[PDB]
Amino acid sequence: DEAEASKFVEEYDRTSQVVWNEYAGANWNYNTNITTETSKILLQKNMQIAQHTLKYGTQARKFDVNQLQNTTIKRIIKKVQDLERAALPAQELEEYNKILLDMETTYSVATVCHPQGSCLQLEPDLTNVMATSRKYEDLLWAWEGWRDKAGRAILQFYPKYVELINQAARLNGYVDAGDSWRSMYETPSLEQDLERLFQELQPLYLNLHAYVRRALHRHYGAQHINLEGPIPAHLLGNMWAQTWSNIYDLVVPFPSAPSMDTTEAMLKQGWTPRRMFKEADDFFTSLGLLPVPPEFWQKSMLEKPTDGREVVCHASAWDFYNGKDFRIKQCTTVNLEDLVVAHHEMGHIQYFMQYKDLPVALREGANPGFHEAIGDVLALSVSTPKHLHSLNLLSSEGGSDEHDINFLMKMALDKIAFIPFSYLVDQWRWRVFDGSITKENYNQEWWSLRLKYQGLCPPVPRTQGDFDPGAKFHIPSSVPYIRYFVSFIIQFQFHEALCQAAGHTGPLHKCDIYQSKEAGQRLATAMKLGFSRPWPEAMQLITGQPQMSASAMLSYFKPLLDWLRTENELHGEKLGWP
Ligand SMILES: *[C@@H]1O[C@H](CO[C@@H]2O[C@@H](C)[C@@H](O)[C@@H](O)[C@@H]2O)[C@@H](O[C@@H]2O[C@H](CO)[C@@H](O[C@@H]3O[C@H](CO)[C@@H](O)[C@H](O[C@H]4O[C@H](CO)[C@@H](O)[C@H](O)[C@@H]4O)[C@@H]3O)[C@H](O)[C@H]2NC(C)=O)[C@H](O)[C@H]1NC(C)=O
Ligand SMILES: Cc1ccc([C@H]2CC[C@@H](C(=O)O)N2C(=O)CN[C@@H](CCc2ccccc2)C(=O)O)cc1
Ligand SMILES: *[C@@H]1O[C@H](CO)[C@@H](O)[C@H](O)[C@H]1NC(C)=O
Ligand SMILES: [Cl-]
Ligand SMILES: [Cl-]
Ligand SMILES: [Zn+2]
């Protein structure tokens, strides 16, 4: 009995490695070369992996896991009992796979065109407009145009996608797809836990929001900014207003303490995408962590092809499930933001390499937020003025309180501004999946949450037929989002713990863990666990305690909270958007 279950997981692991490796290859070939042929091969491989999933999932469901003694075998078998989409009848499975491919293709090839003019792609063209234009009408054209082309085109697919992903979830024992996604955390209190963390970040977010709102009022004019209302969503430097650091120039706390133009510094000094990933590789190996294999440099797609190919440009990291072949696919631009993206993606690769000797069923992060946090933790140190100066991308900014608050503001524009965005995406999707939001009010309920949590409003009233969530990658690609909220909380917990392990003293935000082998050892021990244990054990290995907690993020930003309260007080800001 115990013997049959052990043999079963060994057979599952051997066959899964082969089949998943073949699927990853076809998926990569489409993502890096969108054509009719690669799409047809991918859809064929979808049916092949579904045949495998159904074979072994059916066998797994014949084991009574209650009666099994070994907890690891119990854990693997319970997981394999979830067939995901392979639980669907063949007709519905084929339809679902086609819908998913059609949605992700639509998003990745959408363009926004001037009339009798050029056509802009999201990356780099529209991204650059949102980041650098300071003309209200030009930002509006990009913001509205992207939603008109990408968002509206996804709406035809989304109701059927919801029906089918929910049907698959119910056939695997869940009430709906959102229930199945939340289960990845193995934390029954997840919704309350995340709500409590969100509430703890409200003082910081509300003060940052009011300060930025004031600065936008100064630049774009009193007729366009209501000092007691929500901020128009196209003015924050980012297509989704999810991170705001590209408008640092408008909101600099101490303009008498100017910062080097990091983009021009990277270009002037001959930085390339390959150099950016080599720097990230060096940071990981400086902690005693693993270098990427030579194969990574041969097979990765680190810049947008020029040979005519259409590609999925959205950055991602790829495990080919053979313990040797790991790759990044990124349409890298030479700027500081994409340097942080490169570190994010290299953190995924590091996790892949750390747990490569686990059975594939356990080759995941402790929870999905852990997988998202690794690269960001290192990027926190990379982003310090100390480290950036050592890269010759900033001048010496130390020994200056003005520079200090400026740096904290730069970090807050990304890290704090993202908290409400990353919270609300799956608040919306969970309610779509549970049927509380129907296609009658997809977009209205999206903007109700954009208002409630982020304090943003659409610059143009939305109309029937708009489907603005479809204009955000993870929606048509069916990638869960709450992982990023979890990641932004725990990455500061990890930073705090690794800084203590490295012997750092003084303010948390001055810590740079570069070359700390003690810090690397903490991360390595946790990453090697993969998904073999409940995530509180990995939390404990890194931080010395088992809970998610906002206290580390609050500690990091405490000096900025103090400065923002003083600044907002003396300007008489009314926090929030009553
Ligand atoms: C429950 O079952 C799990 C899983 O068992 C494994 O999978 C089954 C399907 C079946 O194939 C089993 O035969 C198979 O072991 C058990 O977890 C495993 O436990 C073993 C032994 O503790 C671990 O073996 C380790 O493998 C490492 C490979 O990288 C190796 O380096 C380790 O060696 C270390 O320890 C020796 C001790 O002298 C030391 O000399 C070495 O130098 C080195 O430090 C070690 O051999 C597996 O990694 C575990 N696998 C997983 C997935 O966790 C588990 O023990 C069992 N539970 C109970 C209560 O028995
Ligand atoms: C500077 C910076 C740093 C990090 C990001 C990350 C976090 C926010 C989120 C977002 O931009 O909203 N973000 C990505 O999206 C990156 N890319 C996905 C791809 C995930 C994927 C999973 C499965 C299939 C395909 C893709 C991934 O690495 O996690 C953004 C920007
Ligand atoms: C793109 O895909 C087509 C069809 O599969 C193939 O013939 C072609 O060689 C591919 N191009 C590249 C650059 O891989
Ligand atoms: Cl939007
Ligand atoms: Cl998730
Ligand atoms: Zn990620």
Residue-by-residue DSSP string for 134-194: --HHHHHHHHHHHIIIIIHHHTTTHHHHHHHHHHHHHHTT-SSHHHHHHGGG--TTHHHHH
The total of other beta-carbon atoms located within 10 Å of residue 113's CB is 11
Cα–Cα nearest to 492, from 539, 553, 423: 553
- Residue 147 counted as an annotated binding residue: yes
- The rounded Å distance from CA 525 to ligand 1 centre is 15
Resolution of this entry, Å? 1.6
Quote the CA–CA distance of 532 and 269 in Å, as a whole number.
44
Pseudo-torsion of CA 20, 16, 480, 274, nearest 10°?
-40
Which two structure tokens, joined as six digits, stand for 516? 């700390």
Contact 224, 457 (CB under 8 A): no
Pick the ligand that lies closest to the CA of residue 354: 1
Instruction: Give the distance from CA 382 to its chain's centroid.
Output: 18
Contact 85, 97 (CB under 8 A): yes
Which residues does a 6 A CB cutoff place in the pocket of ligand 1?
A: 6, 9-10, 70, 72-73, 357-359, 532
Residue 434 has φ and ψ, to the nearest 5°, of -85, 0
Residue 520 maps to a domain: yes
Instruction: Give the distance from CA 506 to its chain's centroid.
Output: 30
**Cα-only R_g, the chain:** 24
- The rounded Å distance from CA 29 to ligand 3 centre is 8
Which two structure tokens, joined as six digits, stand for 463? 């109309």
Pick the ligand that lies closest to the CA of residue 470: 4
Contact 237, 250 (CB under 8 A): no
- The rounded Å distance from CA 33 to ligand 3 centre is 6
Structural method: X-ray
Residue 571 class from Cβ within 10 Å (0-12 exposed, 13-18 middle, 19+ buried)? exposed
At 112, is the secondary structure helix, strand, or coil? strand
Closest atom of ligand 1 to 362 CA is 52
Quote the CA–CA distance of 164 and 181 in Å, as a whole number.
15
Helical residues (DSSP H) of 62-123, grouped into ranges: 71-80, 90-109
Kindly provide the b/e burial profile for residues 229-257, where b requires at least 16 CB atoms within 10 angstroms of the residue's own CB: ebbbbbbbbbbbbbbbbbbbebbbbeeeb
Q: How many helices (H) and strands (E) does the chain have?
A: 25, 6
Pairing of strands 119-121, 231-232: unpaired
How many domains are contained in the chain?
1
Quote the CA–CA distance of 511 and 488 in Å, as a whole number.
17
- Residue 446 counted as an annotated binding residue: yes
- The rounded Å distance from CA 489 to ligand 5 centre is 14
Residue 577 maps to a domain: no
Residue 578 maps to a domain: no
Amino acid identity for residue 66 in this structure? N
Which two structure tokens, joined as six digits, stand for 203? 């003082």
Pairing of strands 111-113, 316-319: unpaired
DSSP code, position 12: H
Which residues does a 6 A CB cutoff place in the pocket of ligand 2?
A: 314-317, 337, 340-341, 344-345, 348, 372, 477, 479, 484
Which residues lie below 8 Å from residue 270, measured CB to CB, with a gap of 6+? Answer: none
Which two structure tokens, joined as six digits, stand for 33? 């070369």
Closest atom of ligand 3 to 38 CA is 5
Half-sphere exposure of 578 (CA within 13 A, CB side): 3
Residue nearest atom 25 in ligand 2 by C-alpha distance: 316
Pseudo-torsion of CA 314, 367, 238, 318, nearest 10°?
-10
Which two structure tokens, joined as six digits, stand for 34? 């969108």
Residue nearest atom 16 in ligand 1 by C-alpha distance: 72
Residue 566 maps to a domain: yes
Which residues does a 6 A CB cutoff place in the pocket of ligand 3?
A: 33, 35, 37-38, 309
The position carrying tokens 């030479």 is 334
At 529, is the secondary structure helix, strand, or coil? coil
- The rounded Å distance from CA 304 to ligand 1 centre is 43
Amino acid identity for residue 103 in this structure? M
Residue 235 maps to a domain: yes
Q: Give the Å distances, CA to CA, from 22 to 83, 101, 209, 293, 363.
A: 18, 18, 47, 20, 17
Contact 24, 320 (CB under 8 A): yes
- Residue 450 counted as an annotated binding residue: yes
Residue 406 maps to a domain: yes
Cα–Cα nearest to 65, from 82, 83, 78: 78
Residue whose CB lies within 8 A of the most ligand 2 atoms, among 244, 479, 491, for a mutation test: 479
Active-site residue set: 345, 474
Residue 419 maps to a domain: yes
- Residue 483 counted as an annotated binding residue: yes
Question: Domain containing 64: what range?
Answer: 2-572
